[PDB]
């Protein structure tokens, strides 16, 4: 894996 | 077709099994041929008579056209003229002979067809043998080059002999001179052309002093890429120990030799015991169908059903397959006597095969 | 994945090491130290390879 990168909760209230 | 100008000719001016080869015709007309005797004894009259009339008194022929065409074809296959020029020059030579003909001319013509046949064969084998012209050019160039190197001499002359061997051992390679230089093409219509004069001029200064300096890439830029190609082309030649090792030139040669080696090598490497015959399967399916039909629409007993099936068989096939049919009938008989469920299943289900041990 | 033109690219910073790789380490340190008031990271090219 990792040979893939481009090499160079929301609810109601949760403030 | 064929390169032998005699053969590649004689296909053009010749019949097929005429009286040009009198012996074969005379053998076939009497009885002598063994492949198919009595063939000639039963042809129509005219034909027979005509051959015979031809056979006893042969008819003379004029071979001028054959010989002239042979020599013309020899010229064509030897790049003396273009094929259109061949069509023209055939008539040209024919007129030339016809307006000066004599027995001496015919004799010289036979001599000439022999000579051109030999010439074509020699040209082909020489073209596949090594192309002496390249060798001559290379020797001239080497005479132009000096034979003395102040720093190191054994490696230089060893390399020179290696180059000589390379140009000799691979035909189709070209050595020549176009401008004030000599070159080396590895093949006609081929890439990889090495400026031999420039390569030698550059390499003159690297023969006997690059051994101690091979470890540091301080002088490695002195090798012009053309000379690098020149060295690469001689990797298969100049085997180990020919050029003193631990030398930059020697190191490159050894590396290239090892590489090419692994490659060619790798490349040449590259990359229920009894079951029934269709006829017996047909017989089995017929037996199943007949026994099932009798047992289901006539209500007869299984033994009588088996008996009734047997008789209604084609006598030729029944006699031909007497053992297998007999064994199958006995097996089905004892199965129906012992295990009715198994018998009914095996007589009613297609895709059934006799179990091993029935053999 | 084109070894033929890889060197001709890496020299023009088309594909290759990143900006903070090929630079002299001293220059990278200097750029980090004076990033706030005299920018330098915009001067140099930084390649991205899919």
């Amino acid at each position: 894996f990792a040979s893939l990168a481009p090499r160079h909760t929301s609810n109601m209230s949760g403030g | 077709t064929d390169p032998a100008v005699r053969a590649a000719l004689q296909s053009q001016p010749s019949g097929l099994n005429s009286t040009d080869d009198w012996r074969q015709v005379m053998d076939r007309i009497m009885s002598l041929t063994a492949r198919n005797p009595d063939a000639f004894r039963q042809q129509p009259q005219a034909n027979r008579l005509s051959a015979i009339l031809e056979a006893v008194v042969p008819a003379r022929a004029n071979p001028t056209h054959e010989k002239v065409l042979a020599i013309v074809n020899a010229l064509a296959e030897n790049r003396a003229i273009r094929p259109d020029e061949a069509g023209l020059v055939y008539d040209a030579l024919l007129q030339r002979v016809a307006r000066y003909n004599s027995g001496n001319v015919q004799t010289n013509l036979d001599r000439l067809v022999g000579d051109v046949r030999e010439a074509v064969a020699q040209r082909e084998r020489a073209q596949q043998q090594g192309n002496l012209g390249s060798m001559v050019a290379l020797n001239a160039f080497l005479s132009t080059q000096p034979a003395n190197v102040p720093r190191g001499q054994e490696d230089y002359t060893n390399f020179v002999s290696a180059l000589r061997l390379m140009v000799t051992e691979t035909p189709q390679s070209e050595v020549y001179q176009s401008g004030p230089d000599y070159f080396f093409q590895t093949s006609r219509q081929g890439l990889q052309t090495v400026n031999l004069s420039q390569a030698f001029k550059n390499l003159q200064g690297l023969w006997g002093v690059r051994a101690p300096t091979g470890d540091r890439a301080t002088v490695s830029s002195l090798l012009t890429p053309n000379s690098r190609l020149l060295l690469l082309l001689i990797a298969p030649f100049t085997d180990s120990g020919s050029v003193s090792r631990d030398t930059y030139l020697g190191h490159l040669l050894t590396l290239y030799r090892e590489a090419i080696g692994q490659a060619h090598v790798d490349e040449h490497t590259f990359q229920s015991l009894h079951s029934l015959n269709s006829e017996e399967e047909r017989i089995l399916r017929y037996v199943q169908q007949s026994v099932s039909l009798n047992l289901m629409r006539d209500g007869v007993t299984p033994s009588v059903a088996l008996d009734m099936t047997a008789r209604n068989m084609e006598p030729g096939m029944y006699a031909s397959n007497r053992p297998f049919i007999n064994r199958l009938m006995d097996y089905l008989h004892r199965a129906a006597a012992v295990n009715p469920e198994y018998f009914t299943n095996a007589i009613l289900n297609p895709h059934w095969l006799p179990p091993p041990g029935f053999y | 994945a084109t070894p033929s033109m890889m060197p001709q690219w890496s020299y023009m910073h088309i594909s290759g090491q990143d900006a903070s790789e090929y630079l002299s380490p001293g220059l990278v340190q200097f750029a980090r130290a004076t990033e706030t008031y005299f920018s330098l990271n915009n001067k140099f090219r930084n390649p991205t390879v899919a």
Binding site: - | Y176, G190, L191, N195, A259, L348 | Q8
Partner: protein, 165 residues
């Protein structure tokens, strides 16, 4: 330019026939250093030499449940379920369980062509075989010794294919 560090030649593919069309020097990737001094000019020449070394070398050296065809299929030989066959009496209604016979169905499904081909080249093999070729000393021989493959209008057997017939 220089007969020692030459810009490489890049082949052109003809998809349709499978042969390789004429090639040419690469003309889309040249570097314009005409505004540089000897330092960078030597550096660029060295880079092109490195590229040529990479090309030459590369070219020369580097040349139950069978998968079925992407969706595996199971395989059964004695899976025969409906043992009845319609004789004069029976009357078999709708039926059918599709099962691949081991030898007949599968082998008949995976046989190759009757006789192998002899012609052009596909795309992948063309990419693997026709790398850009570096021509070192261009056209240095006598007439007839030049690489004729480069001219697209040149036919191998009949030389110099006259365009427009």
């Amino acid at each position: 330019m220089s007969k020692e560090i030459p810009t490489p030649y890049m082949w052109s593919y003809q998809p349709q026939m499978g042969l390789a069309a004429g090639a040419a020097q690469d003309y889309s990737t040249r570097i314009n250093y005409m505004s540089a001094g000897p330092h960078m000019i030597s550096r660029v020449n060295g880079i092109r030499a490195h590229r040529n070394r990479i090309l030459l070398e590369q070219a020369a050296i580097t040349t139950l449940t069978i998968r079925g065809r992407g969706i595996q299929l199971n395989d059964e030989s004695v899976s025969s379920s409906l043992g009845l066959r319609p004789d004069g009496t029976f009357q078999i209604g709708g039926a059918g369980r599709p099962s691949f016979t081991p030898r007949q169905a599968i082998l008949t499904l995976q046989t190759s062509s009757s006789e192998p081909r002899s012609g052009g080249i596909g795309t992948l093999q063309f990419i693997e075989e026709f790398v850009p070729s570096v021509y070192f000393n261009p056209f240095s021989g006598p007439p007839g010794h030049y690489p004729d493959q480069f001219i697209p209008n040149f036919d191998a057997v009949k030389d110099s294919a006259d365009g427009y017939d």
